[PDB]
C-alpha cells in the first residue's frame, strides 16, 4: 500500500480557538482524506467519547462518502442530551440527533479556555420554539416568541419573550454548570464513491522468497 499521507483536518475541528453557540452550531464537511480515528478514540483528553452504529474497534477499516463534524459549547449537565432519542432544551430546540444516528459524540471540559470571572455571556441557546427541531436542523431566527394567548406586537413584553438565553459561565461554577466543547461526527454512505477511509497498514518488502 502507498504512504500514509493527506490525513483528515480533525486538528482544525478539535483545536479551533473559537467554538459556536449551540443554537447556531457550525458544520464542517470532511472529504477526500485518510481518517486516522485512533488519535481521537484512544485520547485520554475527552470526558465523553462514544459511538452509535459503529464500534471504535471497527473504525480505521471502514470507508464513507462524507463525514460531518458539528461543533458547539453547552453546560456539562447538558452533554447528556447529545444522544439518539433524548429530550430537553438542547435536544428539543437547539441540536437534534436522529434515532438511527451513525456517528460519534465527543466532549471535553473547557472552563480554562472559555469561562472568565464575571461570566462569559458570548454563548447562547434557544429557550423557546413553537415546535421541536427535526434531526440536523438549525434555527438562527431571532423573532420574539409569543408564549401566551395575547397577539404580540413583535417586541419583548408580558407573555412575549426574546428566544435566546446566554450561559453564565463563571470559572467557579460546579462541574455540571461548567462549559463543555462538543464535537459530533456523523458518517454517511451514498451511491457516490467513498472518499474518507482509514489508514492502510503495510508490512516490509521481502524479496527472493
Amino acid at each position, epitope marked *: 500500500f502507498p504512504n500514509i499521507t493527506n490525513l483528515c483536518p480533525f486538528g482544525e475541528v478539535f483545536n479551533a480557538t473559537r467554538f459556536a453557540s449551540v443554537y447556531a452550531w457550525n458544520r464542517k464537511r470532511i472529504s477526500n482524506c485518510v481518517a486516522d480515528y485512533s488519535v481521537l478514540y*484512544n*485520547s*485520554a483528553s475527552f470526558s465523553t467519547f462514544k459511538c452509535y452504529g459503529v*464500534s471504535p474497534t471497527k473504525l480505521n477499516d471502514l470507508c464513507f462518502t462524507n463525514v460531518y463534524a458539528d461543533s458547539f459549547v453547552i453546560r456539562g449537565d447538558e452533554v447528556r442530551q447529545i*444522544a439518539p432519542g*433524548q429530550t430537553g432544551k438542547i435536544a428539543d430546540y437547539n441540536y437534534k440527533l436522529p434515532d438511527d444516528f451513525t456517528g460519534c459524540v465527543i466532549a471535553w471540559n473547557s472552563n480554562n479556555l472559555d469561562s472568565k470571572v464575571g461570566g462569559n455571556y458570548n454563548y447562547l441557546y434557544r429557550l423557546f420554539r413553537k415546535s421541536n427541531l427535526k434531526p440536523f436542523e438549525r434555527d438562527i431566527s431571532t423573532e420574539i416568541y409569543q408564549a401566551g394567548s395575547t397577539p404580540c406586537n413583535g417586541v419583548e413584553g408580558f407573555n412575549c419573550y426574546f428566544p435566546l438565553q446566554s450561559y453564565g459561565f463563571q470559572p467557579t461554577n460546579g462541574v455540571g454548570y461548567q462549559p463543555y466543547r462538543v464535537v459530533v461526527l456523523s458518517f454517511e454512505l451514498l451511491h457516490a464513491p467513498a472518499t474518507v477511509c482509514g489508514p492502510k497498514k503495510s508490512t516490509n518488502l521481502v524479496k527472493n522468497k
Partner: antibody
Amino acid sequence: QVQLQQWGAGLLKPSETLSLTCAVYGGSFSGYYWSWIRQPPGKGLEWIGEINHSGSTNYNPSLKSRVTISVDTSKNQFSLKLSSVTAADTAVYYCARRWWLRGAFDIWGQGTTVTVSS
Amino acid sequence: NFMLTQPHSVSASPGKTVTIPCTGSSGNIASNYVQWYQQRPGSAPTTVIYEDNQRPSGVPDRFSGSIDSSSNSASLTISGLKTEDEADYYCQSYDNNIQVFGGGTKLTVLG
C-alpha cells in the same frame, strides 16, 4: 489465537516485593493496552495499572506510590513489581489485554495466587 | 472519585428473567461505555456485554444490556435462566483515566 501466560513467586511475607511476569504468544505488544488486575479472596476486581500502545505507564492513584510496570519487547513479556507488600496484597493477580483505551478487557492471563503471610 | 455499585446477590428459578443493576455515583454512567463480565468460580472473567448494548460472538442472545441517563444506571438482563448462568457478574467502565469495576453480584439459579 493470542494467549497470555503468567508466572512468579506466589508465597511471600510482609515487607517483601512482589514480582510477576506475563508473556504473550500469537501476538505483539505495540498496538494494545496491557493491564494488571487483582482480586482479593472472596472480593471484587481492582485495576492496578497499565501500559498503553507504544509503552507509557498509567497507574491507579491508590497503588501508584509503590508499583512499577515494565515491558521487555525482546521477549513479548511484561511485569509487575509491587513493593513492601502486606497481608492486604493477598489476591489472585491477572494480566489482561484491552484493544483501545475505553474498550473491554478482551483477553486474560490464567491468574496467579499471591499469599502474603509471616 | 467515580464509583459503580451493584447488589451483592440476585436469584431466580430456571426459565425466569433477572435484571442486575449497576448504578453510577460521583459522575454520569452514560458518558463512556459499560462492559459486563461473567466470572465462573476459579477462572478468569469473560465479557458477556462489551459496549452498552453489544454482545460478543459466542455469547447467548439470552443476555442483553441497557443504560439509563435519567437513573444514572446500567443493567444486565439474563432472560430464560439456565443453571449454568450461576456465576459472579461485574460491570465496568472508564472514567478520568482509571478503569472502574462494580463490586460484583453473585447470581444463583434457584435449584
